[PDB]
């Protein structure tokens, strides 16, 4: 039997599996352990035998995928898909917290572009989540001096020092007094989800002519970007307009729903990456159609459980808040 370590954005988990264990059986233990039921967004990422970041396929034996000759096997539990609207679609506090931490990681390392003024508001919600209500006795000058709060490109391209950035974040921290940490997490996600790069998987492609471009795959559809501008799509293909996505030997074809419009063609060189593109397209299209049908009874019951858990946590805080 095989020892496994799974890291979420804020937890270490240890498991032992049979060598016959599928992805789905390992994944099911992870989500049961952390109490996550919104499982459709998530997957297990690992570094393969060549050092490439790889999604574990749930419908295959773990040890048959290109996992390393390590012990224990290491995985990262991460969101693979994003909702169109966090308010509507992230039901559980755990789901909200794991999206929050994964997105904030990508904001702070400059993976997800964020203008300075937005970075300050995001940081103010991250502070409310970490520290709770501002109190001028504890949150003295320097209270944020030890925190990674802004993207490096925001800290670089300005001549404000550490102290001036902390003062700007504090103004908004003070404004969030009375906000539950979980409500700050949600307000963070509501701002982040409107960023141009939020929830976009980028891939390096060419058109027929050989112009170097980017493909974006996201919740809403496909986008084509100029090489030097990953913020503004030059062309958009909503999932509602895509009949089929396929590739054969570097050549991708996007067939439209309107059978009289032409196909869109692009080229991507790596078989490994082309499979990953196809999997994100099929996964994003399936969730696009699913969120346009009515909530399953299962989802209604998760919504109920979440609302009751939230009501219960309020009662407990009411009881403690009262004692003194």
Swiss-Prot record:
Gene Ontology CC terms, in alphabetical order: adherens junction; apical part of cell; apical plasma membrane; basolateral plasma membrane; blood microparticle; cell periphery; cell surface; cytoplasm
Domain note: The [IL]-x-C-x-x-[DE] motif is a proposed target motif for cysteine S-nitrosylation mediated by the iNOS-S100A8/A9 transnitrosylase complex.
Organism expressing this protein natively: Homo sapiens (Human)
Residues recorded with modification Phosphotyrosine: 113
Disease named in the record: Immunodeficiency 50: A primary immunodeficiency disorder characterized by onset of recurrent bacterial or varicella zoster virus infections in early childhood, profound lymphopenia, hypogammaglobulinemia, fluctuating monocytopenia and neutropenia, and a poor immune response to vaccine antigens.
Single GO term (MF): actin binding
UniProt note on tissues of expression: In all tissues and cultured cells studied.
Domain of life, per lineage: Eukaryota
Activity regulation (record text): A head-to-tail association, of the N-terminal and C-terminal halves results in a closed conformation (inactive form) which is incapable of actin or membrane-binding.
Function: Ezrin-radixin-moesin (ERM) family protein that connects the actin cytoskeleton to the plasma membrane and thereby regulates the structure and function of specific domains of the cell cortex. Tethers actin filaments by oscillating between a resting and an activated state providing transient interactions between moesin and the actin cytoskeleton. Once phosphorylated on its C-terminal threonine, moesin is activated leading to interaction with F-actin and cytoskeletal rearrangement.
GO biological process: cellular response to testosterone stimulus; establishment of endothelial barrier; establishment of epithelial cell apical/basal polarity; gland morphogenesis; immunological synapse formation; leukocyte cell-cell adhesion; leukocyte migration; membrane to membrane docking
Localization annotation: Cell membrane; Cytoplasm, Cytoskeleton; Apical cell membrane; Cell projection, Microvillus membrane
Modified residues (N6-succinyllysine): 80
Residue numbers bearing the N6-acetyllysine modification: 76, 136, 162
Alphabetic keyword roster: Acetylation, Cell membrane, Cell projection, Cytoplasm, Cytoskeleton, Disease variant, Host-virus interaction, Membrane, Phosphoprotein, S-nitrosylation
Subunit structure: In resting T-cells, part of a PAG1-NHERF1-MSN complex which is disrupted upon TCR activation. Interacts with NHERF1. Interacts with PPP1R16B. Interacts with SELPLG and SYK; these interactions mediate the activation of SYK by SELPLG. Interacts with PDPN (via cytoplasmic domain); this interaction activates RHOA and promotes epithelial-mesenchymal transition. Interacts with SPN/CD43 cytoplasmic tail. Interacts with CD44. Interacts with ICAM2. Interacts with ICAM3 (via C-terminus). Interacts with PDZD8. Interacts with F-actin. Interacts with CD46. Interacts with PTPN6. (Microbial infection) Interacts with HIV-1 envelope protein gp120.
Name of the protein in question: Moesin
Motif residue range(s): [IL]-x-C-x-x-[DE] motif: 112-117
Domain FERM, residue spans: 1-292
Parent-protein start and end of this portion: 4 to 327 of 577
């Amino acid at each position: 039997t095989i020892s496994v370590r799974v890291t979420t954005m804020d937890a270490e988990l240890e498991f032992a599996i049979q060598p016959n264990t599928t992805g789905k059986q390992l994944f099911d233990q992870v989500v049961k352990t952390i109490g996550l039921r919104e499982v459709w967004f998530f997957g297990l990422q690992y570094q393969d035998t060549k050092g490439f970041s790889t999604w574990l396929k749930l419908n295959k034996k773990v040890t048959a995928q290109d996992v390393r000759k390590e012990s224990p096997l290491l995985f990262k539990f991460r969101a693979k898909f994003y909702p169109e609207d966090v308010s509507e679609e992230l039901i559980q506090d755990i789901t909200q917290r794991l999206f929050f931490l994964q997105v904030k990681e990508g904001i702070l390392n400059d993976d997800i572009y964020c203008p300075p003024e937005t970075a300050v508001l995001l940081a103010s919600y991250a502070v409310q989540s970490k520290y709770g209500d501002f109190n001028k006795e504890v949150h003295k000058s320097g209270y944020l001096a030890g925190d990674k709060l802004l993207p490096q490109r925001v800290l670089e391209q300005h001549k404000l020092n550490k102290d001036q950035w902390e003062e700007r974040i504090q103004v908004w921290h003070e404004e969030h007094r009375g906000m539950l940490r979980e409500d700050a997490v949600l307000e963070y996600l509501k701002i982040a989800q409107d960023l141009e790069m939020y929830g976009v998987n980028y891939f390096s492609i060419k058109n027929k002519k050989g112009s170097e471009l980017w493909l974006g795959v996201d919740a809403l559809g496909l986008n084509i970007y100029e090489q030097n501008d990953r913020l503004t799509p030059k062309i958009g293909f909503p999932w509602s307009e895509i009949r089929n996505i396929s590739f054969n030997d570097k050549k991708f074809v996007i067939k439209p729903i309107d059978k009289k419009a032409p196909d869109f063609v692009f080229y991507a060189p790596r078989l490994r990456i082309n499979k990953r593109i196809l999997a994100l397209c099929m996964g994003n299209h399936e969730l696009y159609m699913r969120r346009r049908k009515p909530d399953t009874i299962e989802v209604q019951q998760m919504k109920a459980q979440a609302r009751e858990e939230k009501h219960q946590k309020q009662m407990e805080r009411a009881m403690l808040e009262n004692e003194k």
